[PDB]
Every structure is written in C-alpha cells, then in structure tokens.
Design an enzyme around this catalytic site. Structure first.
Site, PDB file in Angstrom:
ATOM      1  CD  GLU A  36      -2.800  -1.403   2.185  1.00  0.00           C
ATOM      2  OE1 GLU A  36      -2.973  -0.671   3.180  1.00  0.00           O
ATOM      3  OE2 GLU A  36      -3.112  -2.614   2.174  1.00  0.00           O
ATOM      4  CD  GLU A  84      -3.797  -4.919  -0.261  1.00  0.00           C
ATOM      5  OE1 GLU A  84      -2.976  -4.339   0.477  1.00  0.00           O
ATOM      6  OE2 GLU A  84      -4.938  -5.244   0.119  1.00  0.00           O
ATOM      7  NE  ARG A 118      -7.284  -5.884   2.411  1.00  0.00           N
ATOM      8  CZ  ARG A 118      -6.200  -5.637   3.142  1.00  0.00           C
ATOM      9  NH1 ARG A 118      -6.032  -6.229   4.315  1.00  0.00           N
ATOM     10  NH2 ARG A 118      -5.288  -4.779   2.709  1.00  0.00           N
ATOM     11  CD1 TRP A 160      -9.970  -0.731  14.584  1.00  0.00           C
ATOM     12  CD2 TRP A 160      -9.400  -0.757  16.745  1.00  0.00           C
ATOM     13  NE1 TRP A 160     -10.698  -1.727  15.192  1.00  0.00           N
ATOM     14  CE2 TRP A 160     -10.367  -1.766  16.519  1.00  0.00           C
ATOM     15  CE3 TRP A 160      -8.895  -0.583  18.036  1.00  0.00           C
ATOM     16  CZ2 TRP A 160     -10.836  -2.599  17.536  1.00  0.00           C
ATOM     17  CZ3 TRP A 160      -9.363  -1.413  19.051  1.00  0.00           C
ATOM     18  CH2 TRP A 160     -10.326  -2.409  18.790  1.00  0.00           C
ATOM     19  CD  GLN A 253      -1.111   0.939   6.270  1.00  0.00           C
ATOM     20  OE1 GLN A 253      -2.062   0.260   6.693  1.00  0.00           O
ATOM     21  NE2 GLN A 253      -0.999   1.309   4.997  1.00  0.00           N
ATOM     22  CD1 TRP A 303       3.778  -4.304  23.970  1.00  0.00           C
ATOM     23  CD2 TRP A 303       2.416  -3.570  25.586  1.00  0.00           C
ATOM     24  NE1 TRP A 303       3.094  -5.387  24.466  1.00  0.00           N
ATOM     25  CE2 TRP A 303       2.251  -4.966  25.458  1.00  0.00           C
ATOM     26  CE3 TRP A 303       1.659  -2.885  26.546  1.00  0.00           C
ATOM     27  CZ2 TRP A 303       1.358  -5.693  26.251  1.00  0.00           C
ATOM     28  CZ3 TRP A 303       0.771  -3.609  27.338  1.00  0.00           C
ATOM     29  CH2 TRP A 303       0.630  -5.001  27.182  1.00  0.00           C
ATOM     30  CG  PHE A 356       1.269   0.511  21.156  1.00  0.00           C
ATOM     31  CD1 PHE A 356       1.606  -0.529  22.013  1.00  0.00           C
ATOM     32  CD2 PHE A 356       1.438   0.328  19.780  1.00  0.00           C
ATOM     33  CE1 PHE A 356       2.090  -1.736  21.508  1.00  0.00           C
ATOM     34  CE2 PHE A 356       1.921  -0.870  19.269  1.00  0.00           C
ATOM     35  CZ  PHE A 356       2.246  -1.906  20.134  1.00  0.00           C
ATOM     36  CG  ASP A 365      -3.186   1.197  25.041  1.00  0.00           C
ATOM     37  OD1 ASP A 365      -2.970   0.347  25.932  1.00  0.00           O
ATOM     38  OD2 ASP A 365      -2.302   1.718  24.329  1.00  0.00           O
ATOM     39  CG  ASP A 367      -3.156  -4.290  27.340  1.00  0.00           C
ATOM     40  OD1 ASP A 367      -2.952  -4.663  28.512  1.00  0.00           O
ATOM     41  OD2 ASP A 367      -3.233  -5.083  26.383  1.00  0.00           O
ATOM     42  CG  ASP A 368       0.601   0.627  25.894  1.00  0.00           C
ATOM     43  OD1 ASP A 368       1.706   0.069  26.029  1.00  0.00           O
ATOM     44  OD2 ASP A 368       0.011   0.697  24.795  1.00  0.00           O
ATOM     45  CE1 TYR A 411      -5.486   2.747  21.761  1.00  0.00           C
ATOM     46  CE2 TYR A 411      -6.559   0.868  20.715  1.00  0.00           C
ATOM     47  CZ  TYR A 411      -5.412   1.604  20.970  1.00  0.00           C
ATOM     48  OH  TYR A 411      -4.201   1.229  20.425  1.00  0.00           O
ATOM     49  CG  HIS A 442      -2.432  -7.179  30.874  1.00  0.00           C
ATOM     50  ND1 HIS A 442      -2.436  -7.040  29.501  1.00  0.00           N
ATOM     51  CD2 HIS A 442      -1.759  -8.325  31.136  1.00  0.00           C
ATOM     52  CE1 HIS A 442      -1.788  -8.056  28.957  1.00  0.00           C
ATOM     53  NE2 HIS A 442      -1.368  -8.849  29.927  1.00  0.00           N
ATOM     54  CD1 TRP A 480      -6.263  -6.535  23.272  1.00  0.00           C
ATOM     55  CD2 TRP A 480      -5.574  -5.851  21.250  1.00  0.00           C
ATOM     56  NE1 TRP A 480      -7.158  -5.595  22.816  1.00  0.00           N
ATOM     57  CE2 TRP A 480      -6.758  -5.161  21.580  1.00  0.00           C
ATOM     58  CE3 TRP A 480      -4.956  -5.582  20.021  1.00  0.00           C
ATOM     59  CZ2 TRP A 480      -7.336  -4.220  20.725  1.00  0.00           C
ATOM     60  CZ3 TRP A 480      -5.530  -4.649  19.174  1.00  0.00           C
ATOM     61  CH2 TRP A 480      -6.706  -3.980  19.529  1.00  0.00           C
ATOM     62  CE1 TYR A 486      -0.358 -11.607  26.024  1.00  0.00           C
ATOM     63  CE2 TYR A 486      -2.465 -11.185  24.948  1.00  0.00           C
ATOM     64  CZ  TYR A 486      -1.328 -10.718  25.579  1.00  0.00           C
ATOM     65  OH  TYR A 486      -1.154  -9.367  25.731  1.00  0.00           O
ATOM     66  CG  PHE A 592      -8.186  -6.644  13.687  1.00  0.00           C
ATOM     67  CD1 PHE A 592      -8.448  -5.922  14.845  1.00  0.00           C
ATOM     68  CD2 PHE A 592      -7.910  -5.953  12.505  1.00  0.00           C
ATOM     69  CE1 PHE A 592      -8.435  -4.536  14.832  1.00  0.00           C
ATOM     70  CE2 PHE A 592      -7.894  -4.569  12.484  1.00  0.00           C
ATOM     71  CZ  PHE A 592      -8.158  -3.857  13.654  1.00  0.00           C
ATOM     72  CG  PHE A 596      -3.658  -7.096  11.015  1.00  0.00           C
ATOM     73  CD1 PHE A 596      -3.009  -6.990   9.793  1.00  0.00           C
ATOM     74  CD2 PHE A 596      -3.249  -6.281  12.061  1.00  0.00           C
ATOM     75  CE1 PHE A 596      -1.968  -6.081   9.617  1.00  0.00           C
ATOM     76  CE2 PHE A 596      -2.214  -5.370  11.893  1.00  0.00           C
ATOM     77  CZ  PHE A 596      -1.573  -5.269  10.670  1.00  0.00           C
ATOM     78  CE1 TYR A 600       1.981  -7.251  19.225  1.00  0.00           C
ATOM     79  CE2 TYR A 600       3.004  -5.560  20.568  1.00  0.00           C
ATOM     80  CZ  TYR A 600       1.916  -6.032  19.856  1.00  0.00           C
ATOM     81  OH  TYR A 600       0.766  -5.283  19.760  1.00  0.00           O
TER      82      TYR A 600
HETATM   83  C1  LIG Z   1      -0.494  -6.450  23.371  1.00  0.00           C
HETATM   84  C2  LIG Z   1      -1.387  -5.446  23.351  1.00  0.00           C
HETATM   85  C3  LIG Z   1      -1.046  -4.043  23.785  1.00  0.00           C
HETATM   86  N1  LIG Z   1      -1.932  -3.008  23.185  1.00  0.00           N
HETATM   87  C4  LIG Z   1      -1.899  -1.776  24.020  1.00  0.00           C
HETATM   88  C5  LIG Z   1      -1.645  -2.719  21.754  1.00  0.00           C
HETATM   89  C6  LIG Z   1      -2.471  -1.579  21.088  1.00  0.00           C
HETATM   90  C7  LIG Z   1      -3.234  -2.044  19.810  1.00  0.00           C
HETATM   91  C8  LIG Z   1      -2.332  -2.759  18.760  1.00  0.00           C
HETATM   92  C9  LIG Z   1      -1.103  -1.902  18.366  1.00  0.00           C
HETATM   93  C10 LIG Z   1      -1.317  -1.150  17.036  1.00  0.00           C
HETATM   94  O1  LIG Z   1      -1.494  -2.113  15.986  1.00  0.00           O
HETATM   95  C11 LIG Z   1      -2.465  -1.946  14.993  1.00  0.00           C
HETATM   96  C12 LIG Z   1      -2.124  -1.809  13.611  1.00  0.00           C
HETATM   97  C13 LIG Z   1      -3.140  -1.644  12.646  1.00  0.00           C
HETATM   98  C14 LIG Z   1      -4.520  -1.613  13.038  1.00  0.00           C
HETATM   99  C15 LIG Z   1      -5.653  -1.441  12.039  1.00  0.00           C
HETATM  100  N2  LIG Z   1      -6.670  -0.559  12.257  1.00  0.00           N
HETATM  101  S1  LIG Z   1      -7.820  -0.437  11.168  1.00  0.00           S
HETATM  102  C16 LIG Z   1      -6.988  -1.666  10.219  1.00  0.00           C
HETATM  103  C17 LIG Z   1      -7.352  -2.210   8.983  1.00  0.00           C
HETATM  104  C18 LIG Z   1      -6.527  -3.186   8.408  1.00  0.00           C
HETATM  105 BR1  LIG Z   1      -6.983  -3.894   6.814  1.00  0.00          BR
HETATM  106  C19 LIG Z   1      -5.344  -3.632   9.040  1.00  0.00           C
HETATM  107  C20 LIG Z   1      -4.970  -3.102  10.268  1.00  0.00           C
HETATM  108  C21 LIG Z   1      -5.798  -2.111  10.859  1.00  0.00           C
HETATM  109  C22 LIG Z   1      -4.849  -1.749  14.418  1.00  0.00           C
HETATM  110  C23 LIG Z   1      -3.830  -1.914  15.386  1.00  0.00           C
END
Ligand SMILES: C=CCN(C)CCCCCCOc1ccc(-c2nsc3cc(Br)ccc23)cc1
Ligand SMILES: C=CCN(C)CCCCCCOc1ccc(-c2nsc3cc(Br)ccc23)cc1
Ligand SMILES: CCCCCCCCOCCOCCOCCOCCO
Ligand SMILES: CCCCCCCCOCCOCCOCCOCCO
Lengths: 619, 619
Positions: A36, A84, A118, A160, A253, A303, A356, A365, A367-368, A411, A442, A480, A486, A592, A596, A600
């Site tokens: 992309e 892609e 998609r 997000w 992104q 994090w 984060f 967030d 979590d952090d 969030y 956590h 997550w 986990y 997700f 996705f 780490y």
């Molecule tokens: C271990 C967990 C700790 N937490 C504190 C982490 C905070 C959230 C995840 C860190 C950021 O990562 C992301 C990257 C991309 C996205 C996303 N949004 S919309 C979307 C659409 C597509 Br397609 C692909 C990716 C995305 C979300 C989180």
C-alpha cells in the site's frame, strides 16, 4: 541451573536498551503495509526509485515457495495480501511472466481473482483505477452528522476504525482515480473462471445495509448533494484536530495513509498537516540487513519499555538500578495529560493514561496504562512525588475507564455497539472495541501490585466478568496476543495477584488445561490458526514467549514445582542463544482475531526473562 | 555621467541576490514586535535567557534620548510602543530606577499611563495580569456563527484583521492570565494624575457597540454560555485550516502570536500545528551585528524579488540574463494554485496569484501578483510555455479580483464594509481592505506591459477610479508606501503605460505638484507625518526611494529633460555609496496610515536603480 540462562537474558535486554532509556522492537505484520505504501507513493506522486528497490527485495524475500504471501509466518496463502503484493511488484517494474509473478497469479486466479478480495483491496485498486468505484461499499461524509447518541455515529466504532472511517468518507465522497501507467495495469486479476467467493460483513449483513448501500451509490450519482461540502469539512476538521505529534493519525498505518490521500484530494499538499504527515512516515520505516525496507503497522516503544522494566525487575535488578531509573524517568514524560476521544464518554474523568507509540495523546489505551503504571510502582525514582503522582493519575484513569460488564476495553468504554459490525464496508477484522479478558487481566494485576484485592467492588465486578467469560475447557481467549495460552496466562497471573485463591475449581481447571497442551519438547506453542479452527487451541510449534506465558500461569497457580513446570523451564534454558536472547520465527501477537497478526520482536526476550524471574522467585 | 552610478547600483543588487535566485531585505517596524515576543515567550513558558539578552540590547539601542520609542525613525514618542518596550525591559530584568526606565516611565505617566494605550497594549497587559480583563473590548467566539452575508461576519474584515479576530475570540473567550513574577509587575503605569486621553474606535463609536460590548462582558459573567464550545471549536478549526506553510498564520506577526496563545489555551502544545507554529518563528528573527535580535513583522522575499527584477531590467540587463532567469524560475515555483479566502467572493475564479512571504497560499495579494506577473513578462525563460501560462493565470486572477469601483484592493474584493470600523476593539489602523490608488496603479501598469490600454473596459473603469480619487492639489494618496510621492509616482507611471495622454490637465497638475515639493538638495522626501498633518504632504528629509518615485512620475510625464528632473538624478548620483547602494535612515513604507509604518530595506537600492534605468531610457 537456569540462573546463568537468566543472568545472560538480563545482560542481553540491557544491551538492547536505547540511550534515552526505552526499549523498542520492530512490529511485524504482512506485506500489505509495504504494498500500500508503494501505491500511496504513486498516488502522492512521490516515488523514490531507490526505496522501490529495497521494497521489491523485501516483498520477494517474504514470498513463499508456492509464490504466495500469508498473514503470519507458516500460514495459509492469503488472497488479499498476495493480490496487493502482486500489484505492488508489477508497479515497481516486474514482468507478469517472471517465476514469482506467475506462481502468485495462478493462486490469485484459482481463488476467483480480484472479486474475492476484502473491501480494502478492491478500494485501493479502485484508487488507481483497476476496479469500478461503484462496486465498493460506500461510506458517506454525511456520517459526520450523526450525533453522539445515534446508531452508527463515528463514536460507536472502535478508535482504530473511527479515524479510518472519517478519512475515508472524504475519499469516497470524491471517488478519485490516479491511473497506473499501462505497463502495470493488472486486468489479469479478472481472468478467472472460478466463481467469486466473496467475504461478507463481519457479523452478517442485514438486507437493510445492503439496500442502504445501493441507495448511497445512487445518491452519489446525483448532480447536487446538499450539505455535503459541510460534511466533508466536518471530517477534514475532525482529522486536523487529531493528527498525532509524529505526524501520523492514531499512530497506525490505515487512517494515516488515508488521511494523507484525503488531504491530497483536498488540494492541501502545501499545508503543514500534510507535510508533517508525509515526513512522519520515515520514523515507521525499517532498513533490513538483506537490503530490504519494511514499514511498521505501528510502533511499540512504550509497551516494550513497560514490559522490559517488569521483566528486569521480577528478574532481579534493584528497584533503583540506574538503568531502570533511566526508563522510569522516560515513562513519566510519556504520560498523557489532555482529553482524548474517550472523554466523550467520561467528560469528568481526569486524563492520566499512556499510549502505545511515542507521541499519540488522543488515544491512550488501558493495556499500556496498566503495564506502565504497574511498572512504575516497582521502581524507586529520584522524583518520588512525580512517580507517586503519575501512578495516581494513571490508576484513577484506568478505574474510570472500566466498562459496564466489569471488564476493560482497550481505548473506549462500553464500545460494545453491534450495529457497525454489519455494514458492507466492514468485512475485515474488528470494528468495535468491547472489553477483553487479557486487558481486564492486566488491569487487575496492575491494581494488585498496589495491594488492592477482591474486597474492593471494582476488582470483584472484574473477576465476575472473567469468571463468566472463561471457556468450557477452562481457558481464556487471547484478544491481543496469540492466544488461549496468552489469555489463560494473563488471567491466572492476575487472579493470583488480586488475592483470589489459586486452589479454586475454575483456577485449577485452567492450570490443568495448560499442562495438557505442553508440547513434547518441553515448551508450549499455539499457532495463529487457533482463531480459525478450535482444533488448534493450545497447539502449535513451541515459542519462547508462548512457553513463558503458560509457564507464568503455572507459577501463579502454585504449580511451580511441577513436572510440566520444570520441563518448561528446561526448554527456555536450552533453546536460549549464546548472547542471551531467544529466537521466535512465529507470531505470538494478535491485531484482529483471524484477520491480522503481529510479531512483537521483544516478546521472545522479555517474557522468557519475566517467566524465569518468576520461577526463581518461587524458590 | 550617471552611467557609472547605475552600473555600480546594478553590480550591488546582483551581489545582494541569494543563491536560490531571490532577493530578500529585512522589514523594519517598531519594538512592539520584540516586546510582544518577550511576553509571548513568558506565556508559553519558553524563555531563552540568551535571546532575552539580544533583545534587551535591541530595545535599548532603539530607545531615544528622551527615553521613548517611536513608530518610525525621527518620529514623535509613541505611548503604546514605549509602554510595551518598558514592560518588556522590566521583565528581562531591568530595575525601574535605571536611566532608560526612568526617562521612559516619566513619559508614560505624562500621558495618563496605561489607560491611554490602544486596546492591544491593554490586552497584552491583561494576559500577564497587569490590567483587568473586563476593561478590554470583547470579541466573542460566537462571531464565528455570522453567515457569509451578515453584518460583522469575519469576512467583512480585512484579511489581516480577520485571522487576528478569530484567534482572539478564543483567547477572550477564556480570558486567561499568566502572572508575571513580582520583580516585573508594573503598577507604576497607573501612578499618574494626567487624565486618561483614550483613543476611540477608528471611525467613531456608536452608543450601540458601546452597549453591546457591555452586554458581552455581562454575558461573559454568566455560568453557562450555550453553544460557546461550538463557537470556539469553529474558530479553532478555522485556524487549523489556514495555518501557513512556514507555520505562521497570514505570514504576519499578530494572528500568528495570538493563534499560538490560543492553542496553548486549548492545551494543544503537543499538537503539530503548535509545534510547527512555534518553530516557524525563527525564520522571521534577525541577528543584528551589534549583538541584538529583532523579529520581522512580516517578510518580503517575493515583493523584493519582483521589484529587483523590474529594476535590473529597466536598467539594462538582457531579458535572458542568467542571473535574472534564476529569479524568474524561482518566481514561477511561487505561484499559488489553490483557493484562498478571496474565493468566498469569487468561487468561479481560478487561482493564480502570488503572496508577499515565502509560503502563504491562502492570502495572495493583488499588489505582488501584478509586480510578479509583470516582472515575468519582461523575461526570457527556458520553459516558455510555463512562463506564458503562469502570467495567464495571474493575469486572469488580477482581472477577476477587480472591485466594483474599478480599483483593486490588496487581498479581497469589495471589502468595503464600514461596520467593522466602529466596534470598540478596533482602535488601531485599518480593519477593512477597500481598493487603493497605489495597488490599482500597479495593476494598470502590469496590464500595460502586455500592450492593453484605455480601449479595454477594465482599464477604463480603473482610470475613472483614479481620476475620481485624485486629490485637490493633483496628488494621489499612498496607501502602502509613504506617501503622496509614492502614490502620485505610481499613478502617473501607470497611466503613462496604459496609453493615457500625459499632456492632459490632471496628469500635468500632478507632475507640477511633484516639482513643487523638490527639496533644495535636489531630491524629494516625505516624512511619515504626512498621514497625520496635511502640512507634511510632500515635505520631509530627502530619501533615495522617495526621490526615485517623484523622479519616475516626472520621467513618465515626459518631463525627463527638466531642471527638477536633472536635479533629482544628480542627487541620486551623489548620495550613492562607494559599494553601489544607498542609505535611507527613514521609513518609506506604510503598514496602516497613521498607526504602523515599515522600512523596506531594499527600496533604497531598487527604486533608485529603477528610476535611473528609466532616465537613461528616456534618452
Ligand atoms: C499487546 C497489546 C497491547 N496493546 C496496548 C496494543 C495496542 C493495539 C495494537 C497496536 C497497534 O497495531 C495496529 C495496527 C493496525 C490496526 C488497524 N486498524 S484499522 C486496520 C485495517 C486493516 Br486492513 C489492518 C490493520 C488495521 C490496528 C492496530
Ligand atoms: C508595498 C506593498 C506591497 N504589498 C503587497 C505588501 C502587503 C501588505 C504588508 C506586508 C505585511 O505587513 C504587515 C504587518 C503587520 C500587519 C498587522 N495586521 S493586524 C495588525 C495589528 C497591529 Br497592532 C500591528 C500590525 C498589524 C499588517 C501587515
Ligand atoms: C475547544 C474546546 C476545548 C475544550 C475541550 C474539552 C472538550 C472535550 O473533549 C471531547 C472529546 O473529543 C476529543 C478531543 O481531543 C481532540 C482535539 O480537540 C482539540 C480542542 O478541544
Ligand atoms: C472541503 C471543501 C473543499 C472545497 C473547497 C472549496 C471551498 C471554498 O473556499 C472557501 C474559502 O475558504 C478558504 C479555504 O482554503 C482553506 C483551507 O480549507 C481547505 C479545504 O477546502
């Protein structure tokens, strides 16, 4: 025995620390980021032939024997990702004949081609004119008019998706087309007999949205859309108000990229926001040794720093170790003191959470915040009143963020609407941010460090939540992080910290479940396929992190001196490298579920260290 | 004779040119810029002891024997300017006893103290808590609701006041106070017996606004102001949308400074707009050789470059002189192609104007646009279609910008409302941007170079405008340059270019007026006092620029071979320095008639060169 393994793990972490005092490992995902990026550059008319090169190398390097690309390493070929990547490579300048292209192309076709991808993949292709805009689900800028309390208002979407939706409404409003040069047009994505096997909206699509979409595509056809300029401006303004410090949007992104395209659409490339947004990209980039370049889906300094500290502490280093103090100091300057989007549901809540990324004040967030606050609570810093103050704001914010069911989202609060999960456009990953077991866990362990327990009403509501969410086999989902190991690992570690009795039934039932999935080689592992096929729950090649997680659950549940436990510790001791680190060719992080995944980079070093520090603790 | 004088002047200008190809002389004003900067820094909690030092030196250096500061050099002590300079110095760390403080302080008192100062001065003092906020004219954020066609909507104010108003409404909405340390509090500004001689609104204040203000201060007192958060956000958004490329707002000191304070008020110091806004300031600063530092009220690269080119051309250098071509190239990359605030009255007009500053796309002005387009018309650049094209866009834009009365304004069309000139707040300089003789003149001569004349309806409407605006004594007011010599010079030079007959009565009547104010020493001069007292019209110490202007009027009106003409040329030939330039300890530029003057550093070199090139032309 393990001691040396531990002292070596410590020495390694400490060497990985940056000067400013923080830790920061790269975040791994999949080639759609770089693919992309390439198309983004094409759109913004800013192509660096040198960068394209480092990208082609990366893309090829990541391609598999079959000529496909997956979401996680050792995963099923993914259509979208491959399409892609295919378009990206062809643009960069690769003949549709060459071995790689050919193999990939056949896979793309054997799937029904472009039509089985998609929404995003078709939308990106729409942007460069390789796909009709009218066959793409529509999202109108007017969405910007829905008030705080109305079905589908931007605040019913997860943080997000929210930003992405807004940025997109501007784009889909203008439906722009940035033609690809002929040499790269990819009609061969349609050349297939296989019937299109289209993926539907997340939770099924009501004939309503289906109709509504068609309606919107028609309304798009008109010659005059009243109040639309306003809707757009209301979206552009929403965007300008939230641009992060590093020039990104949400520090992820997607919205970042779209917001940049949206700004291009609005003839604002001469504007500060755009310039700063464009420039910010470089910070997320990464030079790979084999001559490639990758773009991070996001960055995890905070994090990483947070966990690193907790690891090194539970491992030995004194609460005032000058090296940790350097980190503690860094973490304080990170705390966020202004209102974010969460304030829309907690206007009287004082800000005090953490993000984060480096600078992303509008999206702290839970979590952090919990890991950071908790980490701080284990350090002895010079400015003891600042540390004491930070923790309090953080603590109180977390408390004020607790949702209705007693658990915590990432969030937002009660971001549990279901309506958004049905619209056409949303057919990829999560769209809302409801409470999760892992985050809630956590938070609990965080409070636990402060001494709080099961007596406090807040903790109880939470524990009741976790109890109700437990799975039949006594395991807990991993939202997550991949996955049942986990979550179960987190929950038990937590419950043990908030006073709960490890001897209880459900606690034991969980502990058992852990011993039961121990791989023969001593450690535990759990493939990302466990989100798709329940047969994989707990199953998978052993990894240092996933082993450490199951190992923490066991240590927490009193089973430290156990066969399974001893066995696990052994694994980490053997699989350790000479420098002190560990390897982990698998992903153990979840973006997700099922759509996705993330890798780490620090997990392989930090968690094993944390688990070993806790084993050595229980003796 | 003069030939060497001219060859020397040319060599000098060419040496003053920057690498990129543009010219850029510092713009001089008065100490309220640096004084406010100091207070701004205090507010933003960003005081650089080292910078304060360079500023103290500068302030002191500019102070006069009597211990006061004026607007222009050799001008009457100005109360406001002195008060602000006084407060600035005391803050930086100067005892209220020291010679400079004492002398100044006495002047302040002999005037009625703080109470006799313009609104701004009291507002700034209000910000640091040395003056009651309720005694300051109020401007509510709600002003943001007045629609395009409604008395007092932000688009009825001149471009320069508009931005300031918006930024301010946020500030006056919160009425914040940033206390000064005790050591610098200035109560001694009240210690006076003299009655406060307060300055009223520009065009007089109707009892209505007077009441309305009182109303607003009352509505301010309430505990709940409905729709006010929205009003603010509408203002905040208005600002975010228009921030300039360099991080400023309008490329002028006022709105820039207030917008920055406004952002700080809204807790947005972590935001990109602020950061970029703050960092941008340095570009306007200037290190003085005597160890001081001054801040430019604005910058004039484009304006300078444009005139420099016209000078060097009319003086000899070939249209394709590589050195000029470098400038021509630079000038093309400057053209603005997006809609600005002017588009609100000309939505179907395609953008093609230029700005004064480096990067300020939302505010191209007619004056620059004309000089630039015209300057280009006299060059032979490589990309002949780009040059040909640019001029076209620019040409058309100018045309489409022409106001009703046939004349041109600076930034907007028919920005001739009168309502704004009466509200309490506006008691300093211009608040609207109606057509002016000087701008209109430049436009005319611009077209003139293209061959157009009095036949074309556009030119006629304009000429009729000028004819009706001429003064009794055959002179023409100077809006953006001191003064009657500036305007008359422009007008005649123009009319001669658009075909008009120099022999006409009004033309001659103007020419005569010129000769009649020629100082004994051979050259012409016109003190800035000519805006206050009509007795000074044409009177004042001779300057190179003002001489060049009157000299242009004469050359244009056929009186090249004249006593006065020969005499003037002599003056410039003698007063010229060995390096080629000229000196000019006086201001010949106008910001706001009677309230704010500027010193255009390049005028002293460019105009004399231009006038000499035109004399050598008429022979
Ligand atoms: C271990 C967990 C700790 N937490 C504190 C982490 C905070 C959230 C995840 C860190 C950021 O990562 C992301 C990257 C991309 C996205 C996303 N949004 S919309 C979307 C659409 C597509 Br397609 C692909 C990716 C995305 C979300 C989180
Ligand atoms: C020679 C003319 C060419 N034109 C093309 C010049 C464009 C206008 C002047 C350039 C910028 O100078 C300004 C600086 C400050 C202001 C101002 N606005 S509001 C204001 C309030 C106070 Br108090 C003092 C100053 C200001 C305006 C113009
Ligand atoms: C202009 C109003 C300033 C008062 C702010 C309080 C508003 C409450 O926050 C609501 C949540 O919306 C998210 C806001 O943070 C984003 C940036 O907006 C900046 C200016 O408020
Ligand atoms: C989002 C609408 C885009 C259409 C722009 C045309 C609007 C007409 O201009 C009105 C004048 O206001 C000044 C605008 O330029 C400033 C920045 O706003 C940027 C996006 O339009």
């Amino acid at each position: 025995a393990y001691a040396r393994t531990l002292d070596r793990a410590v020495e390694y972490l400490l060497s990985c620390q940056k000067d400013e005092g923080y830790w920061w490992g790269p975040l791994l995902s999949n080639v759609t980021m770089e693919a992309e990026y390439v198309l983004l550059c094409h759109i913004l008319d800013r192509v660096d032939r040198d960068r394209m090169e480092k990208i082609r190398r990366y893309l090829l390097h990541e391609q598999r024997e079959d000529g496909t690309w997956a979401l996680y390493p050792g995963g099923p070929p993914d259509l979208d990702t491959t399409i892609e990547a295919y378009v990206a490579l062809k643009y960069i300048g690769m003949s549709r004949d060459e071995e790689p292209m050919q193999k990939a192309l056949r896979f793309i076709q054997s799937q029904g081609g472009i039509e089985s991808s998609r929404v995003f993949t078709r939308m990106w292709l729409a942007l460069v004119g390789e796909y009709p805009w009218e066959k793409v689900p529509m999202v109108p800028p007017e969405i910007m008019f829905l008030g705080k309390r109305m079905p589908l208002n931007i605040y019913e979407f997860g943080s997000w998706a929210r930003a992405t939706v807004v940025a997109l409404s501007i784009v889909m409003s203008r439906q722009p087309v940035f033609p690809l040069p002929e040499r790269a047009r990819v009609p061969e994505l349609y050349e297939t007999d296989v019937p299109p096997r289209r993926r539907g909206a997340k939770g099924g699509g009501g004939w309503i949205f289906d109709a509504l979409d068609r309606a919107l595509h028609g309304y798009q056809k008109l010659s005059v859309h009243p109040f639309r300029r306003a809707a757009e401006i209301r979206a552009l303004d929403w965007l300008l108000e939230r641009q992060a410090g590093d020039g990104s949007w949400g520090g992820i992104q997607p919205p970042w990229f779209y917001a940049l395209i949206a700004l291009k659409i609005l003839d604002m490339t001469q504007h500060p926001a755009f310039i700063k947004g464009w420039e910010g990209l470089e910070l997320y980039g990464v030079e790979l040794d084999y001559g490639g370049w990758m773009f991070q889906a996001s960055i995890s300094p905070v994090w990483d720093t947070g966990l690193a500290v907790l690891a090194l502490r539970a491992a030995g280093l004194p609460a005032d170790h000058d090296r940790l103090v350097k980190a503690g100091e860094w973490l304080l300057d990170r705390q966020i003191t202004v209102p974010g989007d969460w304030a829309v549901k907690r206007p009287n809540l004082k800000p005090g959470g953490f993000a984060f990324q480096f600078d992303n004040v509008y999206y702290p967030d839970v979590d952090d915040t919990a890991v950071v606050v908790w980490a701080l609570n284990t350090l002895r810093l010079p400015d003891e009143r600042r540390r004491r103050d930070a923790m309090t704001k953080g603590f109180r914010w977390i408390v004020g963020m607790q949702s209705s069911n007693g658990g915590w989202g990432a969030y937002d609060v009660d971001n549990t609407s279901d309506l958004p999960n049905h619209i056409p456009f949303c057919d990829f990953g999560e769209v809302t941010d409801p409470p999760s077991e892992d985050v809630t866990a956590h938070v609990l362990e965080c409070f636990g460090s402060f001494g709080y327990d099961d007596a406090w009403k807040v903790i109880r509501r939470a524990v009741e939540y976790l109890k109700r969410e437990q799975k039949p086999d006594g395991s807990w989902f991993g939202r997550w992080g991949v996955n049942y190991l986990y979550g179960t690992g987190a929950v038990v570690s937590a419950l043990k910290a908030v006073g709960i009795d490890t001897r209880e039934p459900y606690i034991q039932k969980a502990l058992d479940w852990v011993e039961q999935h121990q791989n023969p080689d001593g450690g535990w592992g759990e493939d990302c396929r466990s989100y798709e096929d329940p047969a994989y729950a707990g199953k998978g090649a052993s990894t240092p992190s996933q082993t450490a997680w199951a190992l923490m659950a066991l240590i927490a549940g009193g089973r430290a001196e156990s066969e399974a436990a001893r066995r696990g510790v052994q694994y980490l001791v053997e699989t350790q490298r000479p420098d002190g680190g560990w390897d982990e060719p698998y992903y153990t992080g979840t973006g997700f579920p099922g759509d996705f995944y993330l890798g780490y980079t620090m997990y392989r070093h930090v968690f094993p260290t944390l688990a070993l520090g806790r084993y050595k603790q229980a003796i």
